Write a protein that binds this ligand. Structure first.
Ligand SMILES: *[C@@H]1O[C@H](CO)[C@@H](O[C@@H]2O[C@H](CO)[C@@H](O)[C@H](O)[C@H]2NC(C)=O)[C@H](O)[C@H]1NC(C)=O
Lengths: 184, 132
């Protein structure tokens, strides 16, 4: 086939989802060019698992799921099979048998704001770890102690989402990164 | 997680040479992205050189023309060859790696590969001391 995959809608979306509420778009029966998806910007990364990046090109008879969201720079390592930490534990989890690619790039120029961008959040607390590709958008007060919270923030009773608050002056590990996860 | 066992540091006079090596675990080594970092006392860690799974290499400006990063995929070994050493090359040097048992391709841009953001595994560090 010779009809272009609409990856431009994923990679070049004006705004990205918070990682805890991550987006998913299905891409099917079209052709693409991995060298167009990844442009090798200085502060960017491209990794594949169980596949060659060339397998992104011929999608004429294949379905790809494009998941996308924003994290901070020092969390990009968690967007991989086998990883631990707040993002992989509580926000976006890949299976051990993940077969696909991860593209992440610094978006300080789009997603920071002099006073703080509070539109991007991540889940800081959860009673247990997500399963692969699970998605949780609940905002129930997290009970960190023995006293039950009754929907009221308080001592040992935490609102579960933390805002990144991205500011363009943040250090290298704290700046925002857009992420596209391509899975087969 | 990748085990990194590192070796070869030492003392040498200015203008001399020294070679670091790093032995890595795993069965997907040729897919790894690999880097060398260094940290002198009372100054923060700095990316020195990187090589991605395709074999493209990147160098900090201060070592271009003197240091060479290379890899031997058949032996799971990473090297840093250091020539024309200067006193300000004195530092503790670390190999870093991004691996994983299903990792099949691994790269990034210049700034990313020379930062710690790329790597989830670090070697134990070896000392290089350049006497004037
Ligand atoms: C996202 O948008 C950028 C910018 O429009 C696209 O990159 C450009 O692609 C054209 C060719 O279509 C080139 O002439 C430009 O030089 C590119 N600009 C760059 C690389 O900064 C990019 O391809 C889009 N991404 C996707 C996935 O569609």
């Amino acid at each position: 086939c010779t009809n272009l995959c609409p990856f431009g809608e994923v990679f070049n979306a004006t705004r990205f989802a918070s990682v805890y509420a991550w987006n998913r778009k299905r891409i099917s029966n079209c052709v693409a060019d991995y060298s167009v998806l990844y442009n090798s910007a200085s502060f960017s990364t491209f990794k594949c698992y169980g596949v060659s990046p060339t397998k992104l090109n011929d999608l004429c008879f294949t379905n790809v799921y494009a998941d996308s969201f924003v994290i901070r720079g020092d969390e990009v390592r968690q967007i991989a099979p086998g990883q631990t930490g707040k993002i992989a534990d509580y926000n976006y989890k890949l299976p051990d048998d993940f077969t696909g690619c991860v593209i992440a790039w610094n978006s300080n120029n789009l997603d920071s704001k002099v006073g703080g961008n509070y539109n991007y959040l991540y889940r800081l607390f959860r009673k247990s770890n997500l399963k692969p590709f699970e998605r949780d958008i609940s905002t129930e007060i997290y009970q960190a102690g023995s006293t039950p919270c009754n929907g009221v923030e308080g001592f040992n009773c935490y609102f579960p989402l933390q805002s990144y608050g991205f500011q363009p002056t943040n250090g290298v590990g704290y700046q925002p990164y857009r992420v596209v996860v391509l899975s087969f | 997680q990748v085990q990194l066992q590192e070796s070869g540091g030492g003392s040498v006079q200015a203008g001399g040479s020294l070679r670091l090596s790093c032995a890595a675990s795993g069965y997907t080594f040729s897919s790894y992205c690999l880097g060398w970092f260094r940290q002198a006392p009372g100054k923060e860690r700095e990316g020195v050189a990187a090589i991605d799974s395709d074999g493209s290499t990147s160098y900090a400006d201060s070592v271009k023309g003197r240091f060479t990063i290379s890899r031997d995929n058949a032996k799971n070994t990473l090297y840093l060859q250091m020539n024309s050493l200067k006193p300000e090359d004195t530092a503790m040097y670390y190999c870093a790696a991004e691996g994983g048992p299903s990792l099949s391709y691994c790269t990034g841009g210049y700034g990313f590969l020379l930062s710690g953001l790329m790597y989830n595994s670090w070697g134990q560090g070896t000392q290089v001391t350049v006497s004037s």
